Amino acid sequence: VPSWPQILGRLTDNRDLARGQAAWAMDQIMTGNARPAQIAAFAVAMTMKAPTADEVGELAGVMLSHAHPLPADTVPDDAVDVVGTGGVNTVNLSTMAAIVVAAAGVPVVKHGNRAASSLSGGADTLEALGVRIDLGPDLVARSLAEVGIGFCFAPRFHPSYRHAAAVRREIGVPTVFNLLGPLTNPARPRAGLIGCAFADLAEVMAGVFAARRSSVLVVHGDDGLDELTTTTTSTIWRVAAGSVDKLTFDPAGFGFARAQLDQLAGGDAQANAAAVRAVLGGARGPVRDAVVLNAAGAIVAHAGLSSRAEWLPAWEEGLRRASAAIDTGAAEQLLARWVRFGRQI
Amino acid sequence: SVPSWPQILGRLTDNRDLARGQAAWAMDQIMTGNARPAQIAAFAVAMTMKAPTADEVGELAGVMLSHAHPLPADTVPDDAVDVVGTGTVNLSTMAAIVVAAAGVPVVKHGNRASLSGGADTLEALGVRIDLGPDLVARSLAEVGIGFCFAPRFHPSYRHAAAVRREIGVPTVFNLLGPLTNPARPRAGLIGCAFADLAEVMAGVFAARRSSVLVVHGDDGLDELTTTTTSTIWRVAAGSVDKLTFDPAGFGFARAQLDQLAGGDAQANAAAVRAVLGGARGPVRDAVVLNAAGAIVAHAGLSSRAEWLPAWEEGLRRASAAIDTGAAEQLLARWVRFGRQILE
Ligand SMILES: Nc1ccccc1C(=O)O
Ligand SMILES: Nc1ccccc1C(=O)O
C-alpha cells in the first residue's frame, strides 16, 4: 500500500525502497497528484539516502512513459547522445562535441532546455548560435534525416514534468532529479557519452544504462568535471551488452598535454557561442582538445553498437575522425546547415 | 555570504553542519511566510537526515519563540514546569495534573491531534483549552496549571504546520514543541522517542540553563513507563549526566505495553478519571513515574540533590497528590475556572 509517509519514512531511515515504490512516487509526481512539499521531500530524501540503479531506473522509466515519442522509424537505430549532468558546467564542451560527432557522420540526438540564469543551458548556447531549439517531434525527425542532428526541447517532450521542474527551481539544490536528463532522452538513443560530476552517481547511471540495450561511456573527470577531462585522468564506466567495465583513462596516452581546470568550464550562452565559433573554425588549444576527446568517446560508444573493434583502435579512430571533422570544416559546415534548416521552417 | 536556500540545502545534502546563523535565517523565512512549501519541506527533510545539532535547533526554536505571543509579564511563576513528549493514554496529561496537585506550577503547550491527544482529552474532561495569554496566566495563578494552545500562540507557524501534515514523516520540527512553550518554563520532564535526538534536546536545555529530565524509553516510548528501563539525561547547571533508569529499583512491577493503550477522547477521559480517583495498576504507576520525574526536575532549579532520594521524594509526593484527592480536586478546580470565563 504505497503512500508518501511510508516512502518518505523509509528514505529518511536510510533504507533502500521496495521495488515499485520509486515508480509509484514518480507517477504521482508526473500526474499532478504530488504536492510541492511531497515532491521536494522525495527529491531530497532520495538524494541523501543515495539512490540505487534500480530506483533510478524506475524514476526514468516512469518519466519516459509520460514523454512524447518521436514518430515511428524516425530515430536512426545507431543515434547517440552527448551530454553531462552538470557540476559549474560543460555545456560548452558537450555542445561542440555533439556537432563534431554529427559532422563525423554519426547521428546525434540531444535533449535539454533553457537554464534559469547565465550558466548556459544546452538549449541556450544552440539558440545563441541561431539553432531553432523548440521543434515538435516531426520536425526533430526531419532534422535528424536532413541534418544528421536533432534537439528535443525538454518542456515540449516532457510536459508532465512541469510540477517537478518548478520544485527543482524553487529549491535550487541538485538532487537525484539532476540524473534523469541523460536517461529520459525522448528519442531513446542506444549509445552515448554521458558525463557525471560525482563518481558514486556515475556508477549508478552506468547501472541504469546496463539494464537497457545500450552502448555508453559514463565518464567522470578525476578533477570533478562532468566530461572526459584533460587536466588529469578520468574514470570511465564502459557499458555494453548489459555489463559494465570500469577503468582509469588517461588522455596523455594519446598525446594530449595536461591543461588547467580554469581553461575548460562553460560560461554563459554568448560566451559559449563565441567559443563554439572559434573551435569549429580551427582554433587550437585546451578547449578544442577536450571537445575532440569527448567527441571521440561518443564515437567509441557508437562503434560499440556494431563494430566490435577493440577499445584502443576504436579510440585511435574516434580521435582521428573527430579531429578531421573539425579540420576539414565538416563541423562548421554542419552547424551552418543546421541553422539553415531552422530558418527554412 | 548572503544566505539562500541553494546554499543552505546544499550544505545539508553534503551532510555538513550549518554555519552559525543559517538555521536562524531559514526559520525566519518560514515564520514570515516567505518560504515556499517546497523549500520548507526540503529544509525539514535535509536537516533531519543530516542530524541537527543543538546549536542548530536552538536557532530554530529561538526564532520561532521570537514570533510567538508571550504570556504577560510576571505572570508565570519562576519555577513553572512542562510535562511533555515529542511523539499512549495521555500519560503526560495525567502526570501534569498530579504535578500541579503536588504544588508545582505546570504550563502545558500543544494542539488537538482518531487517537485522542492531550488537548483533546482535556476538552473531553471539560477543560477550556483555547484561551489567550491573559487567561492562561489567570489559570496558572488561580488553579496552578495552564495550557497554551499552539495555534493561538504560534500563529506564524501555520506555513510549517501545513507542510508537516503534507509529508507526514517526523522531522526536526517534531523537536520544537518542547523548546517553544510560550510560557518559557525553566524546568521540565521531556520525552523523546529517539536516543540521538533526546541527547540533542538535552543540549539545547543545557544551553538555556534549564533544569530538565529528557527521557527515552529503551522500548521507543517518549514517556517513562513500567514496561522497560529508560535512558535519562539529567540537565542542570548547564551540564548533563546521562543515566539508565529502571523502575523495578523502586518496587514497580513490569507491565505490558498494551495495558497502557489509549483510545478515543471519551475512553481516555475515563482513564484520567479512574487514575485521579485512586485506581491502582500500570497506568497509575506510569503517571506517578512521570510526575515524579517532573518534580525531580523542579527540585533541580534550587538544589542539586542526590538522585535516588530525589526520586523517592518525587514518587511519594506524586502518590500523595493522588491519594489525598488533591489531583482529582485540582482537575475539578481547573474545569470550574474555565466555566467561570463566560460570566
Ligand atoms: N521545465 C522543465 C525542465 C526539464 C524538463 C521538463 C520541464 C517542463 O517544464 O515540462
Ligand atoms: N498546527 C499548528 C500548530 C501551531 C501553529 C499553527 C498551526 C496551524 O495549523 O495553523
Side-chain angles (χ1 to χ4, degrees), chain A residues 1-116 120-212 214-307 309-345, chain B residues 1-19 21-113 117-303 305-342:
Chain A
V1 190
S3 71
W4 291 113
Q6 176 196 65
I7 287 166
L8 292 179
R10 196 195 266 244
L11 293 168
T12 62
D13 303 345
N14 253 98
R15 291 204 288 139
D16 294 329
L17 299 181
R19 172 166 65 96
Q21 281 179 328
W24 178 91
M26 198 59 181
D27 201 62
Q28 295 294 122
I29 293 168
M30 295 299 292
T31 51
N33 285 300
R35 302 294 301 246
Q38 297 164 340
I39 299 172
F42 182 69
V44 169
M46 179 63 71
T47 300
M48 294 192 65
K49 193 273 302 170
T52 67
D54 283 339
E55 295 166 345
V56 178
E58 292 192 3
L59 299 176
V62 170
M63 184 167 344
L64 286 177
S65 75
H66 287 272
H68 291 304
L70 271 70
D73 299 313
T74 218
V75 180
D77 176 61
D78 63 332
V80 314
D81 197 0
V82 182
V83 67
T85 53
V88 207
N89 80 29
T90 52
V91 154
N92 63 323
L93 303 171
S94 54
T95 302
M96 287 186 266
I99 288 159
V100 174
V101 168
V106 179
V108 175
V109 61
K110 272 178 82 38
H111 164 224
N113 67 337
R114 307 192 176 100
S120 170
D124 305 307
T125 298
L126 293 175
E127 203 151 47
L129 296 162
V131 176
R132 190 147 206 256
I133 60 163
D134 189 16
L135 297 183
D138 291 278
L139 285 184
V140 178
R142 274 188 62 199
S143 193
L144 269 167
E146 297 165 33
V147 198
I149 192 163
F151 186 85
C152 297
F153 187 48
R156 190 188 277 253
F157 286 85
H158 297 289
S160 295
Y161 193 75
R162 66 182 144 100
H163 310 104
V167 163
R168 290 224 272 152
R169 289 193 296 269
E170 294 179 353
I171 70 176
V173 294
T175 68
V176 67
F177 286 94
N178 290 55
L179 301 189
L180 300 178
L183 295 164
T184 56
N185 181 328
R188 302 203 196 200
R190 292 172 46 243
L193 178 291
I194 313 295
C196 191
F198 303 98
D200 59 336
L201 299 174
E203 185 149 289
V204 170
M205 299 186 71
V208 181
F209 285 117
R212 294 179 181 185
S214 281
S215 172
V216 162
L217 308 191
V218 184
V219 302
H220 172 70
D222 295 329
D223 54 1
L225 209 80
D226 66 333
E227 306 282 344
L228 290 168
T229 183
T230 44
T231 81
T232 189
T233 55
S234 297
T235 308
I236 302 186
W237 289 261
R238 267 174 93 202
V239 181
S243 307
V244 179
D245 170 19
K246 186 189 182 175
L247 65 113
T248 299
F249 176 90
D250 193 341
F254 299 113
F256 288 91
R258 290 291 190 249
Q260 289 293 339
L261 190 54
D262 60 21
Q263 287 171 331
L264 306 189
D268 74 290
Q270 291 303 330
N272 287 5
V276 172
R277 289 187 286 260
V279 167
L280 302 185
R284 305 279 167 148
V287 171
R288 172 202 169 99
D289 283 358
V291 166
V292 162
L293 193 63
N294 288 273
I299 293 168
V300 171
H302 172 267
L305 291 171
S306 292
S307 203
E310 292 191 45
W311 180 248
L312 245 206
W315 268 99
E316 286 164 359
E317 181 69 357
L319 293 167
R320 175 202 71 65
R321 293 174 64 189
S323 297
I326 299 178
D327 294 343
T328 67
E332 191 178 81
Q333 294 154 14
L334 182 140
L335 175 59
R337 198 147 49 237
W338 197 10
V339 170
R340 280 196 304 279
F341 175 87
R343 291 171 175 177
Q344 297 159 339
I345 317 148
Chain B
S1 71
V2 69
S4 68
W5 291 113
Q7 180 197 81
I8 284 164
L9 298 173
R11 200 192 265 242
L12 297 171
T13 64
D14 196 36
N15 194 41
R16 276 195 289 143
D17 291 338
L18 299 178
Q22 288 178 316
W25 178 87
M27 196 66 171
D28 195 59
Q29 293 299 119
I30 290 161
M31 294 301 300
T32 58
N34 283 118
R36 313 271 303 167
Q39 298 161 341
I40 298 169
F43 183 68
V45 170
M47 188 72 62
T48 303
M49 293 188 67
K50 199 270 296 163
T53 70
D55 277 356
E56 282 162 359
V57 175
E59 288 185 21
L60 304 174
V63 174
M64 180 161 171
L65 281 172
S66 74
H67 293 273
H69 293 307
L71 271 71
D74 310 70
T75 58
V76 183
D78 225 311
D79 69 327
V81 305
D82 197 355
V83 185
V84 67
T86 59
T88 211
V89 66
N90 317 129
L91 297 171
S92 70
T93 291
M94 294 192 261
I97 292 161
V98 170
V99 176
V104 173
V106 175
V107 190
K108 281 195 109 314
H109 166 229
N111 201 344
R112 303 196 175 88
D120 297 294
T121 302
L122 295 171
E123 296 197 293
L125 291 167
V127 173
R128 280 193 69 164
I129 61 161
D130 190 0
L131 303 178
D134 282 289
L135 288 166
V136 181
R138 263 191 66 209
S139 185
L140 258 186
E142 299 177 19
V143 184
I145 191 166
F147 190 88
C148 294
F149 185 58
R152 190 201 272 278
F153 288 83
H154 297 289
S156 300
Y157 191 72
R158 63 181 183 282
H159 316 288
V163 167
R164 290 228 261 148
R165 298 192 275 275
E166 285 170 359
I167 68 184
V169 297
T171 70
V172 63
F173 288 87
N174 293 57
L175 300 185
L176 299 187
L179 301 170
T180 60
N181 188 319
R184 309 220 201 175
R186 294 172 47 245
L189 178 293
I190 309 303
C192 189
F194 309 102
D196 56 328
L197 304 200
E199 201 167 283
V200 175
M201 287 207 81
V204 175
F205 287 119
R208 293 180 180 179
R209 288 170 263 269
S210 291
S211 179
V212 171
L213 304 191
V214 184
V215 311
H216 169 64
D218 298 333
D219 62 335
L221 286 174
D222 71 342
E223 266 143 347
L224 298 172
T225 72
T226 66
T227 292
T228 37
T229 64
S230 299
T231 308
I232 297 182
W233 289 264
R234 185 186 200 178
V235 181
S239 65
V240 188
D241 295 335
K242 188 189 132 162
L243 305 175
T244 312
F245 187 81
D246 184 358
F250 297 107
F252 290 99
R254 283 278 195 264
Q256 293 302 298
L257 201 77
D258 87 297
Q259 304 175 283
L260 303 175
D264 66 22
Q266 190 175 151
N268 290 10
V272 171
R273 296 195 203 92
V275 167
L276 303 186
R280 310 288 136 65
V283 178
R284 177 197 163 98
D285 290 351
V287 170
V288 166
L289 288 176
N290 285 284
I295 290 169
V296 170
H298 173 265
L301 297 171
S302 337
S303 37
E306 297 274 36
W307 186 237
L308 293 155
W311 272 94
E312 292 177 53
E313 185 49 6
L315 289 162
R316 195 204 59 68
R317 285 178 67 190
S319 302
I322 296 165
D323 294 334
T324 55
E328 184 177 73
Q329 287 156 16
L330 188 141
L331 179 61
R333 283 196 306 281
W334 200 5
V335 170
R336 198 244 257 213
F337 170 86
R339 292 287 83 79
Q340 291 170 330
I341 289 159
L342 187 67

